Amino acid sequence: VLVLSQNTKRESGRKVQSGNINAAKTIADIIRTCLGPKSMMKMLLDPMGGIVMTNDGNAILREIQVQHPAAKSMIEISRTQDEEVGDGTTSVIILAGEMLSVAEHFLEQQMHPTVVISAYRKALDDMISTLKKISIPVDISDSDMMLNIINSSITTKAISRWSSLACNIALDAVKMVQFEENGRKEIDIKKYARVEKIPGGIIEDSCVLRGVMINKDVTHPRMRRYIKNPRIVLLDSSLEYKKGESQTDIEITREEDFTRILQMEEEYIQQLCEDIIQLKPDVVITEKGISDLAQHYLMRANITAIRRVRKTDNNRIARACGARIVSRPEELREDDVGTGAGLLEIKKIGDEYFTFITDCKDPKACTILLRGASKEILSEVERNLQDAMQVCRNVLLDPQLVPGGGASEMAVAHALTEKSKAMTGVEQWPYRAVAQALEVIPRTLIQNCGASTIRLLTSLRAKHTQENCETWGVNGETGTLVDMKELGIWEPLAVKLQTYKTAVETAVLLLRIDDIVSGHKKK
Amino acid sequence: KTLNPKAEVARAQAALAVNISAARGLQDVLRTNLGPKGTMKMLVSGAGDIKLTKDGNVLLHEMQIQHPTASLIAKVATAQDDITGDGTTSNVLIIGELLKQADLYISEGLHPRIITEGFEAAKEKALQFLEEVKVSREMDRETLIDVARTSLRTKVHAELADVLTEAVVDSILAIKKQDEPIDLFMIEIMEMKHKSETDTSLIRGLVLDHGARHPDMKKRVEDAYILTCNVSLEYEKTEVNSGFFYKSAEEREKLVKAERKFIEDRVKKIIELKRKVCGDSDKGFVVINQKGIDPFSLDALSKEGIVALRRAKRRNMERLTLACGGVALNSFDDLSPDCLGHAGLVYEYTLGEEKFTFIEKCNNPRSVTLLIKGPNKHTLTQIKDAVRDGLRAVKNAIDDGCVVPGAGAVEVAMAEALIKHKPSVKGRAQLGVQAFADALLIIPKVLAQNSGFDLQETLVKIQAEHSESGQLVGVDLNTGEPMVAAEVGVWDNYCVKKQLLHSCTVIATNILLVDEIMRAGMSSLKG
Amino acid sequence: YGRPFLIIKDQDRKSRLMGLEALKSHIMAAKAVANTMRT
Amino acid sequence: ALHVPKAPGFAQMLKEGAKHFSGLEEAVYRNIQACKELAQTTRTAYGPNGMNKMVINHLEKLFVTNDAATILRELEVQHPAAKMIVMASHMQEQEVGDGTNFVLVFAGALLELAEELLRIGLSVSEVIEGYEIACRKAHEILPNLVCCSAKNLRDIDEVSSLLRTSIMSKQYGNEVFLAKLIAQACVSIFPDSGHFNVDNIRVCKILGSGISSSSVLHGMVFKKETEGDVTSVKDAKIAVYSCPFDGMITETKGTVLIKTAEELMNFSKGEENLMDAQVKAIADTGANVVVTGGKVADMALHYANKYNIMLVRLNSKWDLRRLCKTVGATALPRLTPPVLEEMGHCDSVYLSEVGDTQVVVFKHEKEDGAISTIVLRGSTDNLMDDIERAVDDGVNTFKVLTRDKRLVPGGGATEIELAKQITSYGETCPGLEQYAIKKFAEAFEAIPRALAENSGVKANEVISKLYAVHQEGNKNVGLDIEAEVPAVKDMLEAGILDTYLGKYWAIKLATNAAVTVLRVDQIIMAKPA
Amino acid sequence: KLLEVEHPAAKVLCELADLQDKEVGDGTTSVVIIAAELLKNADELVKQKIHPTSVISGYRLACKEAVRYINENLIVNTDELGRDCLINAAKTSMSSKIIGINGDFFANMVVDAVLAIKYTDIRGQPRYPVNSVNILKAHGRSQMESMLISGYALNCVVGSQGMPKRIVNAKIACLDFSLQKTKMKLGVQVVITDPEKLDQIRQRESDITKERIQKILATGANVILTTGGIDDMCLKYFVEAGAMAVRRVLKRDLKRIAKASGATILSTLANLEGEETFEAAMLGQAEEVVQERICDDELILIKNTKART
Ligand SMILES: Nc1ncnc2c1ncn2[C@@H]1O[C@H](COP(=O)(O)OP(=O)(O)O)[C@@H](O)[C@H]1O
Ligand SMILES: Nc1ncnc2c1ncn2[C@@H]1O[C@H](COP(=O)(O)OP(=O)(O)O)[C@@H](O)[C@H]1O
Ligand SMILES: Nc1ncnc2c1ncn2[C@@H]1O[C@H](COP(=O)(O)OP(=O)(O)O)[C@@H](O)[C@H]1O
Ligand SMILES: [Mg+2]
Ligand SMILES: [Mg+2]
Numbered sequence A: 001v002l003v004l005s006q007n008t009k010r011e012s013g014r015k016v017q018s019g020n021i022n023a024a025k026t027i028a029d030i031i032r033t034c035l036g037p038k039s040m041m042k043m044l045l046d047p048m049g050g051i052v053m054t055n056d057g058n059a060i061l062r063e064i065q066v067q068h069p070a071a072k073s074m075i076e077i078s079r080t081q082d083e084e085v086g087d088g089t090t091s092v093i094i095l096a097g098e099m100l101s102v103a104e105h106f107l108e109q110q111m112h113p114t115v116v117i118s119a120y121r122k123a124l125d126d127m128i129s130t131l132k133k134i135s136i137p138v139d140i141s142d143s144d145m146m147l148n149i150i151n152s153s154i155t156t157k158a159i160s161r162w163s164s165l166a167c168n169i170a171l172d173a174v175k176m177v178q179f180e181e182n183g184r185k186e187i188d189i190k191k192y193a194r195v196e197k198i199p200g201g202i203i204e205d206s207c208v209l210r211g212v213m214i215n216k217d218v219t220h221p222r223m224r225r226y227i228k229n230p231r232i233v234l235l236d237s238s239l240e241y242k243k244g245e246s247q248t249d250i251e252i253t254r255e256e257d258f259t260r261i262l263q264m265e266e267e268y269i270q271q272l273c274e275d276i277i278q279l280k281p282d283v284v285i286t287e288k289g290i291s292d293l294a295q296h297y298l299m300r301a302n303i304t305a306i307r308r309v310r311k312t313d314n315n316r317i318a319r320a321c322g323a324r325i326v327s328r329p330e331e332l333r334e335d336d337v338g339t340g341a342g343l344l345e346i347k348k349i350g351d352e353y354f355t356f357i358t359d360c361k362d363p364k365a366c367t368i369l370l371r372g373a374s375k376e377i378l379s380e381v382e383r384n385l386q387d388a389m390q391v392c393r394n395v396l397l398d399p400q401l402v403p404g405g406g407a408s409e410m411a412v413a414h415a416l417t418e419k420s421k422a423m424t425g426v427e428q429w430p431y432r433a434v435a436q437a438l439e440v441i442p443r444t445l446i447q448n449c450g451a452s453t454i455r456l457l458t459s460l461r462a463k464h465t466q467e468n469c470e471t472w473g474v475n476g477e478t479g480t481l482v483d484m485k486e487l488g489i490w491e492p493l494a495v496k497l498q499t500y501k502t503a504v505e506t507a508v509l510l511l512r513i514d515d516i517v518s519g520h521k522k523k
Numbered sequence B: 001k002t003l004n005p006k007a008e009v010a011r012a013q014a015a016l017a018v019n020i021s022a023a024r025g026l027q028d029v030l031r032t033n034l035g036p037k038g039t040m041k042m043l044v045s046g047a048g049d050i051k052l053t054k055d056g057n058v059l060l061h062e063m064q065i066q067h068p069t070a071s072l073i074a075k076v077a078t079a080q081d082d083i084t085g086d087g088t089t090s091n092v093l094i095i096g097e098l099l100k101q102a103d104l105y106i107s108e109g110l111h112p113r114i115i116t117e118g119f120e121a122a123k124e125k126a127l128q129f130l131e132e133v134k135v136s137r138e139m140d141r142e143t144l145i146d147v148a149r150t151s152l153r154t155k156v157h158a159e160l161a162d163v164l165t166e167a168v169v170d171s172i173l174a175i176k177k178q179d180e181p182i183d184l185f186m187i188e189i190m191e192m193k194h195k196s197e198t199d200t201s202l203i204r205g206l207v208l209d210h211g212a213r214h215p216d217m218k219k220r221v222e223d224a225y226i227l228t229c230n231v232s233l234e235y236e237k238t239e240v241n242s243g244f245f246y247k248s249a250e251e252r253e254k255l256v257k258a259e260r261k262f263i264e265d266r267v268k269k270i271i272e273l274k275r276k277v278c279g280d281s282d283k284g285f286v287v288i289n290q291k292g293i294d295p296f297s298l299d300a301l302s303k304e305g306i307v308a309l310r311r312a313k314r315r316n317m318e319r320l321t322l323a324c325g326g327v328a329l330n331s332f333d334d335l336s337p338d339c340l341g342h343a344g345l346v347y348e349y350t351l352g353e354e355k356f357t358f359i360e361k362c363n364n365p366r367s368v369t370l371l372i373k374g375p376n377k378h379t380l381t382q383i384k385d386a387v388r389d390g391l392r393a394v395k396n397a398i399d400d401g402c403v404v405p406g407a408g409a410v411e412v413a414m415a416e417a418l419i420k421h422k423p424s425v426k427g428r429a430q431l432g433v434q435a436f437a438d439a440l441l442i443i444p445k446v447l448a449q450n451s452g453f454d455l456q457e458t459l460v461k462i463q464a465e466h467s468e469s470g471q472l473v474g475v476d477l478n479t480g481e482p483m484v485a486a487e488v489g490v491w492d493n494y495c496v497k498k499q500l501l502h503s504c505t506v507i508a509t510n511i512l513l514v515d516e517i518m519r520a521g522m523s524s525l526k527g
Numbered sequence C: 001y002g003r004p005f006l007i008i009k010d011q012d013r014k015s016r017l018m019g020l021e022a023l024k025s026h027i028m029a030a031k032a033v034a035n036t037m038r039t
Numbered sequence D: 001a002l003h004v005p006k007a008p009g010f011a012q013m014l015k016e017g018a019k020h021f022s023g024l025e026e027a028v029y030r031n032i033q034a035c036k037e038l039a040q041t042t043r044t045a046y047g048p049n050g051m052n053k054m055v056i057n058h059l060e061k062l063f064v065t066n067d068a069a070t071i072l073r074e075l076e077v078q079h080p081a082a083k084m085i086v087m088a089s090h091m092q093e094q095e096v097g098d099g100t101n102f103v104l105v106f107a108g109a110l111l112e113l114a115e116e117l118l119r120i121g122l123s124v125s126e127v128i129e130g131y132e133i134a135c136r137k138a139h140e141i142l143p144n145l146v147c148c149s150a151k152n153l154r155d156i157d158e159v160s161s162l163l164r165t166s167i168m169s170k171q172y173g174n175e176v177f178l179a180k181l182i183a184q185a186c187v188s189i190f191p192d193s194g195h196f197n198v199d200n201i202r203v204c205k206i207l208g209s210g211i212s213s214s215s216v217l218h219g220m221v222f223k224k225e226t227e228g229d230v231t232s233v234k235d236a237k238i239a240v241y242s243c244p245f246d247g248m249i250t251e252t253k254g255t256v257l258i259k260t261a262e263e264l265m266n267f268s269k270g271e272e273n274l275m276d277a278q279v280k281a282i283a284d285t286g287a288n289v290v291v292t293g294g295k296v297a298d299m300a301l302h303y304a305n306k307y308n309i310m311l312v313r314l315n316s317k318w319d320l321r322r323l324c325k326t327v328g329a330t331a332l333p334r335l336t337p338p339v340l341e342e343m344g345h346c347d348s349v350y351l352s353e354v355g356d357t358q359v360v361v362f363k364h365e366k367e368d369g370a371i372s373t374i375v376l377r378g379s380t381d382n383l384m385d386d387i388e389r390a391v392d393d394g395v396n397t398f399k400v401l402t403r404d405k406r407l408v409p410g411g412g413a414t415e416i417e418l419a420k421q422i423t424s425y426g427e428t429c430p431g432l433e434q435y436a437i438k439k440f441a442e443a444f445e446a447i448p449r450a451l452a453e454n455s456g457v458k459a460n461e462v463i464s465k466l467y468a469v470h471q472e473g474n475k476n477v478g479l480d481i482e483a484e485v486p487a488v489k490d491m492l493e494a495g496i497l498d499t500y501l502g503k504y505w506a507i508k509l510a511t512n513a514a515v516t517v518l519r520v521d522q523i524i525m526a527k528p529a
Numbered sequence E: 001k002l003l004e005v006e007h008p009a010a011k012v013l014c015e016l017a018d019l020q021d022k023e024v025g026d027g028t029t030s031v032v033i034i035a036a037e038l039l040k041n042a043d044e045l046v047k048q049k050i051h052p053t054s055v056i057s058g059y060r061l062a063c064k065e066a067v068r069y070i071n072e073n074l075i076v077n078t079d080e081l082g083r084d085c086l087i088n089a090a091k092t093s094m095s096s097k098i099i100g101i102n103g104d105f106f107a108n109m110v111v112d113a114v115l116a117i118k119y120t121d122i123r124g125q126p127r128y129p130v131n132s133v134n135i136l137k138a139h140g141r142s143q144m145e146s147m148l149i150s151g152y153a154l155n156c157v158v159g160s161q162g163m164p165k166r167i168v169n170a171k172i173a174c175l176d177f178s179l180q181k182t183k184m185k186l187g188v189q190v191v192i193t194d195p196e197k198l199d200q201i202r203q204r205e206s207d208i209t210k211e212r213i214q215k216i217l218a219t220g221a222n223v224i225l226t227t228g229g230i231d232d233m234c235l236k237y238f239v240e241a242g243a244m245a246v247r248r249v250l251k252r253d254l255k256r257i258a259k260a261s262g263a264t265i266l267s268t269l270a271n272l273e274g275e276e277t278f279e280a281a282m283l284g285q286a287e288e289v290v291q292e293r294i295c296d297d298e299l300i301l302i303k304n305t306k307a308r309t
């Protein structure tokens, strides 16, 4: 055997592009099942042994093992779109699939891909310009408008019957998450809105607590359980005698040295306890363990101690109360004492103790409590709440509104068709081809609704030809041409812009591959 | 199929048929346990353990079935069980009946959205009817007794059921306070494999699972004190690595005699406290320690007449404090006589190899202990499960200010309301309302089938007796004749039924909207 | 990637030699035969 | 993990080894993709500028042809969607004989243009109705584009000018000589009152020099030898005998019975005397060559060589009848002297050899006669097979022209004109069939696009120029071939003429195959044996 | 490089392309194609009964003549416009990539980055060092929104959540030692002989670090970068003092920051005597150090300073 390489398979030509287009079309046809309010839910089985029952476009695509590089690139771009804006995970995939399917008509007509990529970029620029021109501003001080926007954004999920409370929950969460520190920086992180999932109860018992909810219990039953206005303090160091990493040895030759050391240990413990109970606290929250002597001292001083906590939980408690974590007990000072509490009641939710810190002055971190049936319903509700919060944050970051459904797509298509008459050369056919490719979303919505596209498509095309007819969409519930100004369906502009940019980038990346090399074993 | 050849995916009709078949199977399997006239099942594990239980949750968990819908149903049943109390078999029954009624209309050519809307409307109507039909009561001793009897009648026979009802009622009345919710984790459930099951009684106190260790100790004290503590009485070493260095045998003996002086101080302090409290040979002293005790300290305590118990659980620190009224101190700083407890009878019992400790005769105890006796392990487990279910039912009836009659008159009233409400709804929701009304009447059908009477004729007679009257005509299980449910002594719950209906509606909505069971995972066949 | 093409039937079993080595081997074989048939 | 079960109804009783495709995605779309992949294979070999293809079957053979029929026959397709197209191509080749790749391309284009309609929403019924209406319109407008007819059929200066277009599409370069040879062979065998047979042309492959060394022969040839010593025969009187040249015996098993010595001594003498008498009586009628069709004997051969009688032995059960029909003689099942009306008058019967191969040439000096034989010369079997296939295609085209003397402008102007007329007629058609009509009109542009792709020019510019020329007023203007610049050229002045009935039958069969494929809903297969 | 071929000529061509990319970076395939064509042309001469030495000599002579002829076709860069020539060269170099169409902004950004990263030698010819600009990769919008950040960008997050994320006119203090507690060496053991000294030793073990932190922050520092680990006590001290602290920083990034801001990396606090002190003359002065979130992840950016750009 005398060959150059081993177990190598090289394939070039139009076959690679054909296979990539076929894989993209298959992915688009698979993901097109979940679109519009008249869609259905799926069920995935992870190799671990659980049950994944949801309707999001990213949660279903992440549980599918594939082998084609095009499918992997589609999964990657879908995950990036889901991690960027949060919403619009299926529309981008459908648009990319349609754009790659309508691109094979020119590849068979001895057309060079460079002109195709140039036309794609020129169409993307015009689409971005049109979307920025048709931008409609909106005020952020109106709560009814924000509630209507959230309801129209979450009208597709299974919370279509409970959005009357989920909208207010998301609004309160967004209002409590926004915090301004030092300078002119206004960050909106999502690591402080902890979502708890407790099985049982009805879905109407969910609310937003002004604080947090730690699943712990008191160390001793003699401590208090209901305090009016306590002084919750925080700690970091352990409350026990530990060894040293400096390799120390205590060589003793007398007889009372053991008793002296045992007494000095208790004296140091009592000194540390006295240094802790210096500004008269009430509730001590530490991250490590607490010995029995410290617990007895805190019980004698009528102090409540909680052990074994997390760093995120401690940060949330400090943000809700208004204090800071102190490592050394000798440097407690005064400003580090949290006095933002108002209620400390420990209840039992199904043979399990829970800590509740409700009623605060100005809390900046809340914990959403969800009560459902099993775990899949709770996970779906949490995902819907996270999507609603992301949509609200994207709307607050950019006060722009565009008509959703299919009015904006038809308006952009008409604007591109009215401007394509001035172009000439080989950059006119792909422009007009991708100008009509944006109608894949309304066609799919009509097919999923009443399944009568051959009439509604031309009815919407003949209507958008007029002047003041750019906000006419298709109702997914009934199936008639209605105005978007009276229906109340709106969507942000940043999400649509990100979707269009991701679709164009994916089409450009996939329209420049004509070789597959596999069999080098990496190293 | 084109991207993953080793992946099994089903369409909509196939998945719907599979789900309907699984629901029908789970309904036909768990159908002989409804009512007290049901049958008993025997479960044998892989190790050869016989379990004789009658609960629906345990029977569904120990049935060896691998299916996603079955797993979801088991999870929902476990959630209902550990949230409310009793309501596992009826949940699966109503879920299966609703799924069958939905598939009956879907196969003819309908849409699941209209069926879901009709089911939601019927659930709202049933909730309104249950909220407008519930009667308020004061919940006296007879009401709780009747509720516990009705809850425990579907577990054992008659004598054991009444005994367990009386024991649960007495324990609840003993752990009852003037305000605040009823806190659990107070009634200790101890099982003993001796005598029979008819000797089940409630002990006003605490029963430990271990006794004394020193043979030269007192076994029965007529009057002693209770000392609850968790200090260490063993040879504890320092945190830092130390070392002893002597010269001759005298220095070694002196170091040996001096190294055991830390526990000697505590022993002397305890002896002085006991001598100050008692004094003469008339009272006793019991020391309850959570950690181990050295043999030297045990001998020193036995030399004076002290019965100490080592290695105890953490939950016993609160029960003893609530029963006797002592103080669970950790250190020997302010050793005051007021931090002790009062006892009445401290005697142990030997059962072959194990040892017990009974603390009876208390002043005002707040945490009693239920004594369970059984000749076998499966009988003990069944009695414990029945006691837990009865306690949960009593707690649910006490926490609520209303009572719902049992039997099946509530289901008949809900079906009548749904039948009278469908013409008032527009659209195609009338079929969904009719299906929901027909699915709610499955409780009397199973209750009458397991007894030994007819089903259609019994339902017709019940409907005829309920339409012409205005009372809650229940279903009898003795002669089959229609009788009153809220007059004999059959009761149930309101929040439990509400949660059951909510879970059934949620399961129906989740099943009627899922029509694709794709499985695209890793087979993990490498190597 | 230069993929090898099949020319002669069963090429992975036969062996081909140049010419000078074959002539040298033939001369050596003839010399050995003459030395054996010499006594 | 968790495993899902099967559907309790039909999937459980489906039995392993079989398949089921009830959905439109896993059936109609799969068949459309298979047909597209099949059409994308034999697409570069359509026009005269297309290359050949070397296909090897499982019999370890060699087939380097260019027609799509041979490629589809030597492919062994395991797909019904492509099997239907293969059967349609075989039927078209059996009917006409010059319209397989065109039918395949038309069916592929129709399926590709109907897939998008089915995807956007057009159902199968409306698409089928629109396709049928467009096919009827094309069949009605087709007889309106003739403007060309054949005058005489026996003129050598006219037949070779018609089949040259069909020969050039199969053999580019050397076509004038082949056309002249085919015209001469058709003229030498042309009878009267029509009735042209396809079995009157015999092809002979002889490995010789080049292609220009080939010629025609007015008669028949056989690759055998002479049993006797007689070779050069002037006035040959052929006497064909279907019975073997030997002594006739009894059908029933019977032996000879001899007792005395006189019979044992006179049996062989009488047998030889009777054989000599029969040989003398056979040669007394004037026969110069005896062509038998069975086993010969030694004594009979010696007696024939003694009286100078040429013996030709051959067994094929078809060549004997062909020679009898050529020389005008009848077969005799017995060894009896023939009559004057049962004699085979020839011209020159000799034994020569060409290309190191002994052959018996039966050349006749008559201009008419019966059948002829075309001798092929070459150095490769594939080239000889290609030349034979081209000769057969030319003979089929001549037969079609004799059956129907109507001509249509070839190249690509007829398809463009038909598409333009269909688009103009479908503009005034209300309803939902206008989309199907416009899609059927777009399928006619696949021929000029394929021609431009095979030539090496821009297809879009060629199509635009052809449409502009057709809209200006010219109708018989196709696409130029001998020009690297994408331009236009007249088809009537050049001489690019093809048959009309053949194209009509091809379009009809293509539409039939298209509607048959579209009528297929679900697919139910079993397990291979 | 990622081909793995077991042929000697293939490995030779691969190492030649690698050397060409390491010495220059552009034109890695053209040289290989030219070498393959030269080998194919020389094979025909070898097959024509020609000695390889004469062919090699002729190839060397032709290469020398071509090299001597290239100097005849040269164009002075200073005689043209400069900026336009650089833009055209960048667009030509980026013409065979994925950003060939959008080459009007990327070329200008590259030219601006090259003009900003300009180092002077020993009073002679100006130098243009590369591989110093931090090219970060983060998924988000399109490629046209990738602007140029005038300054530095670190790929690390803040230590404690209680530290501010926006400090105006801060002081960059580069350190090359871990901020942890004191620990003795292997040859220095602790033998406690009196019980009245173990507590004092345990207290001093933290008091030394506390005094070191107080002496470090005595000059009024706000930005402190530590390449090693930072304990919880140091984090609490930095939070109480009101200053940022970044742990686990690369050495090259710290060197680039110290060179841009003019600071000096101090591996220890010792001086010319026997006392650990800290001066204020070796503190890098920055401007606005704001932490921005780039798609579910944050990163600290440093703007322009006062030493270099
Ligand atoms: N009630 C409605 N009315 C009009 N348009 C809707 C409605 N619900 C959803 N849509 C449209 O359907 C599209 C898909 O939305 P959805 O399926 O919720 O998420 P994704 O955009 O990720 O697919 C959106 O672009 C939206 O404009
Ligand atoms: N003594 C009784 N008289 C009338 N009905 C009864 C009696 N005991 C049980 N039932 C009925 O049997 C049904 C099943 O009860 P059970 O199996 O104990 O719990 P679950 O209701 O959770 O299945 C109840 O709905 C109740 O109405
Ligand atoms: N000289 C020519 N110039 C242009 N086109 C030609 C010429 N000769 C043949 N053709 C084209 O070739 C096609 C037929 O080619 P061929 O594959 O040999 O037969 P078939 O009709 O069976 O496909 C005709 O449609 C005709 O347009
Ligand atoms: Mg959405
Ligand atoms: Mg029960």
Ligand SMILES: [Mg+2]
Binding pocket: D098, D099, D166, D169, D170
């Ligand atoms: Mg032909």
Ligand SMILES: [Mg+2]
Binding pocket: E026, E027, E093, E096
């Ligand atoms: Mg380059």
